[PDB]
Amino acid sequence: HAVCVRHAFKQYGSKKNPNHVLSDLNMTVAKGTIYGLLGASGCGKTTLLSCIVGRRRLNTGEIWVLGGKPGTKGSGVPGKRVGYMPQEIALYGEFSIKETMMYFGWIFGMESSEINERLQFLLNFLDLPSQNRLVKNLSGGQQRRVSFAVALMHDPELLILDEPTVGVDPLLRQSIWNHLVQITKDGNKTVIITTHYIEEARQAHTIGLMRSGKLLAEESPHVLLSMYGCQSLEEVFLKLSSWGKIKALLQKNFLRMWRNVGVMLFIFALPVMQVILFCLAIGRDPTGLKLAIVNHEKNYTNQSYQECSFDYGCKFSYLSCRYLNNLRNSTILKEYYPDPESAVDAVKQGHAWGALYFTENFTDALVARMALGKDADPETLDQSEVRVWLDMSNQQIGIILQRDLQLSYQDFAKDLLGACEQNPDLAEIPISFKEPIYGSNKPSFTDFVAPGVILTIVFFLAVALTSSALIIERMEGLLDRSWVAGVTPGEILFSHVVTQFVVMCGQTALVLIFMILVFGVQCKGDIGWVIVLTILQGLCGMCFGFVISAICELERNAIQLALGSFYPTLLLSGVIWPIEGMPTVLRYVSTFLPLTLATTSLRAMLTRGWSIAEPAVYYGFLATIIWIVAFLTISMLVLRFK
């Protein structure tokens, strides 16, 4: 007595439009026979098979398969005692036939020495191509044969085949049926084959016709035909009235992505190129700025030559070419125009960014202004000044232009006095800036954004990898087939965490090497805690993949949910702008985001060298741990009623 079912009541719905998928069902599968299930649709048989295996549960009734209640103690139905061929092809792509057979043998605890014998026997018997050909390269009919061979490997004592012969050649169908009737010859082997084709299940010892969630009849085909008088079976149906399984999953995980060139480029080559582009374009100071200089103290020759010469010692010859020599050569390029009304016309168009317009009386008026004091007449206060018309449409370019012009005057003022034996401190504003406590006097914007780029890449490259992996595998029936083989959900998750941990360590090493060793981003603090924080953000992002994959069943739905929170989090975590710019109400809400307090903590360890003991540093560690726990709890709650 292999399988016994009594009063199996099962239904679907929410007490609004309920569906009675199952009804009062009594079914017995005698041991050592071939049992055929010939239901009309493909839902009742599938539900019954799932309940028999253990992947589903009843509402009322009992099931007694191979000795005990399915999925629990007292029996080994989920494991190496059963053979399950799913309705759909639940094979792994980018796998050779030999690799798939070896993987499934390892899952069942078989020895690798005896796997070769079964592989050769099944290749000869099922008429399959060379073992080195990948599964994805096979046709749609050979994949079913590979699935049948996988289900027939370990010689189980109960075979559950779901339409094993859909489009098999008759010369092979006869051989398959001969093998099936040969293995179940005075032995413990039992077959429970479900099919839609009525005429193909005549060789079964016992036939059970299913309709409206219950078995119409269950007898031998010969008795079924004789007691009703029908010629064929078509007329009869016209009734108007743990170590070893983890190593198997680790190899599969590290080989599924190795054979996908697109996956490797997306998760290993994209962070590297993004880091290179960010360090070469964002945060650098402008360099090719142009100015329209009008110098009326000298003759006009070209738009690129002026012949600005003077004396360096004393006597204050020109004091207009002398100032231009103190201009920063790196950022500002000088262009010469003849008239003040012509340089402004160049600024109006795109030919320049500003105008200077030194007057012809600049030298005589300037020397008469610093040598007079507070009694200077208004006339000398006008002729001794530089008139700058600036294009302030750009905020960042305007800041450099204003800063470079004023800074060059401080050097010019400190050069005039000092060359005449004076005190250079006399040309200083009373507001004196001492040595900065943190940083330097010339900070860079690329150093402010770099901590926000490291954490963003690692966080969002784990959401995409985890959500895609757990959705494709589940929707293709692979997770359900690798559970029947005895792989508990505990080791499915454990093997995924280890696989994701390794790839998030390789990404962290590549990002940190290309950012600090190359392009010279400063790291004042401890590098050990930087690595730990970066890894911790990867696990937080990975835990977000669990929530997304447990909510969305379709791939396209998950990406919208993942992309629908990627953009808002970037604009609220203070990655590209200081967090002090937002309103006070919006500032409080943003501190509770997953990436806000972690970015600030990482920015302090890189720009200031703060240790773990500082309150602003370990707040980023506690914020991630809370979000990791919160993400895990949400996923469990979602799976409770789904």
Ligand X SMILES: CC/C=C\C/C=C/C/C=C/C/C=C\C/C=C\CCCCOC[C@H](COP(=O)(O)OCCN)OC(=O)CCCCCCCCCCCCCCCCC
Ligand Y SMILES: CCCCCCCC/C=C/CCCCCCCC(=O)N[C@@H](CO)[C@H](O)CCCCCCCCCCCCCCC
What CA–CA distance (Å, rounded) separates 313 from 319?
12
Which residues 577-616 are close enough to bind ligand X by CB under 6 A? 594
Structure-token pair, residue 164: 């094993």
What CA–CA distance (Å, rounded) separates 403 from 57?
75
DSSP state of 94: S
Q: For ligand Y, which stretch binds (CB under 6 A), given 45-53, 352-360, 450-458, 482-490?
A: 450-458
What CA–CA distance (Å, rounded) separates 427 from 472?
71
Q: Does 567 bind ligand Y (CB under 6 A)?
A: yes
What CA–CA distance (Å, rounded) separates 218 from 201?
13
Q: Does 372 bind ligand X (CB under 6 A)?
A: no
Residues tagged in the binding site annotation for ATP: 12, 41-42, 45-47, 133, 141, 196
x/- letters, 165..204, toward ligand Y (CB under 6 A): ----------------------------------------
Residue 308 and residue 324 in contact, taking contact as beta carbons nearer than 8 Å: yes
Nearer to ligand X, 151 or 464 (CB): 464
Nearer to a copy of itself, 196 or 328 (CB): 196
Quickly list H helices, 54-169: 97-107, 112-126, 142-151
**Breakpoints of the chain, after residues (C–N > 2.5 Å):** 241
Which residues 76-115 are close enough to bind a copy of itself by CB under 8 A? none
Assign 3-class secondary structure to 609-637. Answer: CCCCCCHHHHHHHHHHHHHHHHHHHHHHH
Sign of CA dihedral 496, 499, 502, 504: negative
The distance of closest approach from Cβ of residue 457 to ligand Y in the complex, given in angstroms and rounded to an integer, is 5
**CA angle at residue 539 from 616 to 478, to 5 degrees?**
165
Structure-token pair, residue 258: 């190795």
Which residues 456-485 are close enough to bind a copy of itself by CB under 8 A? 468, 472
Q: Does 566 bind ligand Y (CB under 6 A)?
A: yes
Which run of H or of E encompasses 414? helix 395-416
Q: Name the pairing type of β-strands 60-65 and 3-9.
A: antiparallel
Size of the site for ligand X (CB under 6 A): 21
Q: For ligand X, which stretch binds (CB under 6 A), given 258-266, 385-393, 446-454, 477-485?
A: 258-266
- Return all residues near 291 (Cβ < 8 A) that are at least 6 apart: 332, 333, 334, 335, 352, 353, 354, 355, 356
Beta bridge partners of 162: 194
Which residues 491-530 are close enough to bind a copy of itself by CB under 8 A? none
Which residues 556-575 are close enough to bind ligand X by CB under 6 A? 557, 560-561, 564-565, 569
Q: Does 269 bind ligand X (CB under 6 A)?
A: yes
Which residues 212-271 are close enough to bind ligand Y by CB under 6 A? none
Q: Which of 30, 265, 407, 497 binds ligand X (CB under 6 A)?
A: 265
Distances (CA, A) of 318 to 255, 300, 323: 75, 16, 9
Size of the site for a copy of itself (CB under 8 A): 130
Which residues 390-429 are close enough to bind a copy of itself by CB under 8 A? 390-399, 402, 405-406, 409, 417, 422-423, 425-426, 428-429
DSSP state of 552: -
What CA–CA distance (Å, rounded) separates 494 from 203?
45
The distance of closest approach from Cβ of residue 342 to ligand X in the complex, given in angstroms and rounded to an integer, is 41
Q: Which of 16, 556, 640, 642 binds a copy of itself (CB under 8 A)?
A: 556
Residue 162 and residue 89 in contact, taking contact as beta carbons nearer than 8 Å: no
Q: Which of 250, 367, 559, 630 binds ligand Y (CB under 6 A)?
A: 559
Residues tagged in the binding site annotation for Mg(2+): 46, 162
Torsion of CA 162, 164, 167, 170, to 10 degrees: -140
Beginning with the edge strand found earlier in the chain, give each strand of the sheet holding 60-65 in spatial order: 27-29, 3-9, 60-65
Which residues 259-298 are close enough to bind a copy of itself by CB under 8 A? 262-263, 265-266, 270, 273-274, 277-278, 280-289
Q: Which residue is closest to ligand Y by CB? A: 460
**Residue 587 in 3-state DSSP?**
helix
Residue 402 binds which of a copy of itself, ligand Y, ligand X, none (CB < 5-8 A, kind-dependent): a copy of itself
Q: For ligand X, which stretch binds (CB under 6 A), given 120-128, 281-289, 555-563, 574-582?
A: 555-563
Which residues 328-347 are close enough to bind a copy of itself by CB under 8 A? 344, 347
Q: Does 453 bind ligand Y (CB under 6 A)?
A: yes
Nearer to ligand Y, 65 or 449 (CB): 449
Beta bridge partners of 60: 9
Which residues 289-308 are close enough to bind ligand Y by CB under 6 A? none
The distance of closest approach from Cβ of residue 1 to a copy of itself in the complex, given in angstroms and rounded to an integer, is 29
Nearer to ligand X, 201 or 547 (CB): 547
Binding-site ranges for ligand X (CB under 6 A)? 261-262, 265-266, 269-270, 273, 544, 547, 551-554, 557, 560-561, 564-565, 569, 594, 634
Binding-site ranges for ligand Y (CB under 6 A)? 274, 453, 456-457, 460-461, 463-464, 559, 562-563, 566-567, 570, 575-576
